[PDB]
Amino acid sequence: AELAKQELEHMRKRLNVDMNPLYEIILQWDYTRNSEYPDDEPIGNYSDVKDFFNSPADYQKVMKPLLLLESWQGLCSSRDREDYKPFSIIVGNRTAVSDFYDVYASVAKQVIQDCGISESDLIVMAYLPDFRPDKRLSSDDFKKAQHTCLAKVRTLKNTKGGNVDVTLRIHRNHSFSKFLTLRSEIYCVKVMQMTTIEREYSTLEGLEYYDLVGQILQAKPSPPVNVDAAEIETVKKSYKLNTSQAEAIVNSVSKEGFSLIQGPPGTGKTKTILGIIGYFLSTKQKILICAPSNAAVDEICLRLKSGVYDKQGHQFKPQLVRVGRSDVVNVAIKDLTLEELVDKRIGGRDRDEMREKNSVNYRNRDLDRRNAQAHILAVSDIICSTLSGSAHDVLATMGIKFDTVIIDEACQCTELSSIIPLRYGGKRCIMVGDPNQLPPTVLSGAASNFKYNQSLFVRMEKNSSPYLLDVQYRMHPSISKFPSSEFYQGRLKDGPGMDILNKRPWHQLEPLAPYKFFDIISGRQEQNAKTMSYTNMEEIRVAIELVDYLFRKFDNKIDFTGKIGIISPYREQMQKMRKEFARYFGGMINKSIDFNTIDGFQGQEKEIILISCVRADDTKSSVGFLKDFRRMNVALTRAKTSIWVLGHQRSLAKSKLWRDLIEDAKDRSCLAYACSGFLDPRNNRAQSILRKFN
RNA sequence: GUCGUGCGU
Ligand SMILES: Nc1ncnc2c1ncn2[C@@H]1O[C@H](COP(=O)(O)OP(=O)(O)O)[C@@H](O)[C@H]1O
Ligand code: BEF
Ligand SMILES: [Mg+2]
């Protein structure tokens, strides 16, 4: 009775967290400020992430400055790199709420749709008396303007005549409120989306009431619980795994608390997660799986679609729900999307009466949609999503409790992101990740200097040794020669027959080999003025030529549906690659080929991988974030059979890591020279250039 | 100095 009441109180407190302080602090920031910190407060306030936290208060005190710094850096990046479409609104009556002012304005529905303004968005508002209506309006004008105020879009209500009543929450003490006179035109432009930041702040505040708060603060995973070897052998036989994976699965399931599995790429980490899920289901209980990147969630959903084996070995297919939008979610698992499942479940005076009937019908449809969504969530056993999406409003409103949580690629997410899914009464958490992989995507170098980029998995590994996996079953041994010898200094043993099972017909051809490094003799990349992202068309052309040659050689012999992937460190480079591939081939690229980034492609598996090195210009003299060993390791660990690296030898040779990689490739005679039309006998210019370079 | 992200009414 009393215990249940306390548990319910804690659950509602964790789900319902006051967001007012977050806005009160963020809204005081100056949009026009050009600095690496939100304010001019002493740097001594910020502190490095402590390995051990005495109490939740200390953890919150340490994390809050880092979270604010990360939010400020993201806001600055959106201000510079992102360029939305500014709009104008008419100021209305202002309502005074707790240390805040809510302003109601009338906006055009078409303008709102074009600008993509939602109820969880942040905007910057300015007063420009000298602005010319004919003159173009952009973020540059806001940067130049000195009167800027941050506002939060609290709600968006559509009124008659296609007019939206936008409510904007701002800080009282901000001086810009003096410009918010009634019937005044204010130019507002979107900045960024605060949903992720809001969820992170809510989790940070509610960590006090989390069941595993003590373990997180102490960073001490529950001690291993000894289990009979018979169970381990039975699990290994049923799931056709190895001894290490079976032992890790048994240890993780047997003991409550935090269980960390550290497995380099290709060591069955995803297969280990699937085995854990199957074993738990065999032994109603709902399990929540969260991955930092949507690609990992899509891969997990695709793998689960094939079925899950139990201890007896029989394969069963549980109901899996993907919490996300169709656009971000992959087309292959589009059926598993929650919205698609809900759609499948159901799918004068006279004018006033007709309007009332239409409104009643719409309300009934909304109620039916809510009921179908609730039924799908309740019946479903596996809920796969992302860390940011794990705190979806629907899940919080439903109130269902997830006693088992899995965090895939825990090293790719910050502590707050990894802890977000634990708000739902998480008593058992299993984190799978390899520290050598890419770190969490942090836009602030200062925050990383304070160990903000450090993930909870890394800290837990430092405190105690996780369950280690040293056997791989994906990467070709030749491909894994260099990554294992350099990054891991060994400790990674290839499978008994990886080479035999990785043999492919195109490997026989000299141009195409399991491992090959192609050099761009003549290649330069242009940095975008706004996004500050490099991009070179030479690598795109070379990749297109390689793909066309591979298809022509083995068009009908072997189908390449979902077997060729191209990873580029730069978003702009990936977008250009996809656009040019669509222009050249057409719709086949939608299925036969995939395009992604190294961080966005982390965890993905493809038979053929093309790693595009954007930094193809020697005059730059800098390789960029690629210099880090984790980036190269993740990029190289994507190929299962064939890996092709495109780049400029001179530019990459400057960095020690790429220099060593090129030397290793030369030792194995895997180095190659490529250019425009280097595989075209007609294009004798390419042959002449190759001969001259040699 | 540039790599990610949350929603569908
Ligand atoms: N015991 C095994 N027998 C055969 N194949 C295995 C075994 N364990 C793992 N594999 C293969 O190795 C691959 C492991 O990939 P994984 O390491 O999960 O990728 P990522 O590191 O991106 O998560 C799987 O695709 C699976 O087919
Ligand atoms: F360790 Be794998 F690259 F997800
Ligand atoms: Mg995995």
Residue A602 dihedral angles phi and psi, to the nearest 5°: -60, 135
- Strands A100-108 and A606-612 turn out to be unpaired
To the nearest 10 degrees (0 to 180), the angle between helices A269-282 and A294-305 is: 50
Nearest CA to ligand 1 atom 11: A473
Beta strands A185-193 and A87-90, pairing class: antiparallel
The atom of ligand 2 lying closest to the CA of A264 is: 1
> Which atom of ligand 1 has the smallest separation from the CA of A273?
18
Round to whole Å and give the CA distance between A248 and A273.
10
Q: Which tokens go with A112?
A: 């709102």
Q: Please report, rounded to whole angstroms, the spatial distance between the CA atom of protein residue A446 and the C1' atom of nucleotide B1.
A: 13
Query: How would you classify the pairing of strands A382-386 and A287-291?
Result: parallel
> Dihedrals φ, ψ of A560, to 5°?
-105, 15
Q: What Å resolution does this PDB entry report?
A: 4.4
- The experimental technique behind this entry is cryo-EM
Helix (H) or strand (E) holding A115: helix A109-115
Confirm if A241 and A271 have CB atoms less than 8 A apart. yes
Write out the E strands in A442-570: 467-468, 515-520, 564-567
Q: For residue A467, list its beta bridge partners.
A: A261
A458 vs A427: CA distance, rounded Å: 20
CA distance A338 to A334: 9
A624 touches strand B (CB under 7 A): yes
Q: What is the distance between the alpha carbons of residues A494 and A332, in angstroms, rounded to a whole number?
A: 31
Distance A472 CA to ligand 1 centre (A): 7
Sign of CA pseudo-dihedral A558, A560, A562, A568: positive
CA dist list (Å): A102 to A98, A155, A183: 10, 10, 15
Token reading at A411: 């090293």
Tokens in use for A467?
């369950």
Altogether, the residues listed in chain A come to a count of 694
What is the SS3 assignment for A371?
helix
Q: For chain A, list the domains and their CATH numbers.
A: 1-207 (2.40.30.20), 210-330+382-468 (3.40.50.300), 477-693 (3.40.50.300)
**Cβ-Cβ contacts under 8 Å for A129 (sequence gap 6 or more):** none
On whether A206 is known to bind a ligand per the annotation, the reply is no
Instruction: Tell me how far the alpha carbon of residue A457 lies from the centroid of ligand 2, in angstroms.
Output: 14
**Cα angle, residue A276 at apex, residues A275 and A279 outer, rounded to 5°:** 85
* Packing angle of the helix pair A477-486, A629-636 (nearest 10 deg): 170
Could you tell me the two tokens for A625? 């974030």
Q: After which residues is chain A broken (C to N over 2.5 A)?
A: 283, 347
DSSP state of A173: T
In the three-class reduction of DSSP (H, G, I as helix; E, B as strand; rest coil), residue A124 is classed as strand
Q: Which of A294, A265, A235, A374 is nearest to A606 (CA)?
A: A265
CA A521 to chain centre: 34
Q: Are A609 and A642 in contact (CB under 8 A)?
A: yes
In this structure, what is the dihedral angle of CA atoms A69, A74, A79, A82, given to the nearest 10 degrees?
170
H or E segment and range at residue A117: none
Looking only at the bridges linking them, the beta strands covering A428-432 and A593-596 are unpaired
For A310, residues 6+ apart whose C-beta sits below 8 A from its C-beta are: A238, A278, A279, A281, A282, A316
Q: What is the DSSP letter of A221?
A: P
The two structure tokens encoding residue A127:
């007063």
* Number of other residues whose CB lies within 10 A of the CB of residue A226: 10
Residues A425 and A7 sit within 8 Å (Cβ to Cβ): yes
Give Cα A495 distance to the centre of its chain: 30
SS3 A645: strand
Q: Residue A104 pairs with which residues in a beta bridge?
A: A167
Measuring CA to CA, which residue among A278, A342, A341, A330 is closest to residue A301? A330
Place of tokens 């559509």: A158
Give the pair of three-digit tokens for residue A333.
């698992």
The whole-angstrom separation of Cα A150 and Cα A189 is: 10
- Atom in ligand 1 nearest the alpha carbon of residue A272: 18
Q: How far is CA A156 from the centre of its chain?
A: 28
For residues A18 and A604, what is the distance between their CA atoms, to the nearest angstrom?
Answer: 38
Mapping DSSP to helix (H, G, I), strand (E, B) and coil, where does residue A230 land? Answer: helix
Cβ neighbours around A280 below 10 Å, total: 21
- Asked if residue A295 keeps its beta carbon closer than 7 A to nucleic acid strand B, the reply is yes
Please identify residues in chain A, positions 460-489, with a C-beta within 7 angstroms of any atom of strand B.
none
Residue among A65, A25, A26 at smallest CA distance from A44: A65
Residue A225 sits at φ, ψ, to 5 deg, of -110, 120
Using CA atoms, how far apart are residues A42 and A545, in angstroms rounded to an integer?
Answer: 55
A266 labelled binding-site residue: yes
- What ranges in A283-348 are assigned the alpha helix state H? 294-305, 338-345
Give every CB contact of residue A559 below 8 A, 6+ residues apart in sequence.
none
CB A498 within 8 A of CB A471: no
Largest CA distance in chain A: 87
A414 assigned binding-site residue: no
Supply angle C-alpha A132, A142, A23, rounded to 5: 135
Other CB atoms closer than 10 Å to residue A142's CB: what's the count? 22
* CA–CA separation, A392 and A321 (whole Å): 13
Measured in Å, residue A596 CA sits from the centre of ligand 2 at 15
The conformation of residue A625, written as its DSSP 8-state character, comes to G
User: What is the rounded CA–CA span in Å between residue A194 and residue A553?
Assistant: 49
CB atoms within 10 A of CB A102: 17
What's the token pair of residue A479? 């491909």
> Other C-beta atoms within 10 Å of A182: how many?
9
Q: For residue A87, give Cα distances in angstroms to A76, A102, A123, A127, A192.
A: 20, 19, 10, 12, 15
Q: How far is CA A255 from the centre of its chain?
A: 29
| CB of A484 closer than 8 Å to CB of A492 | yes
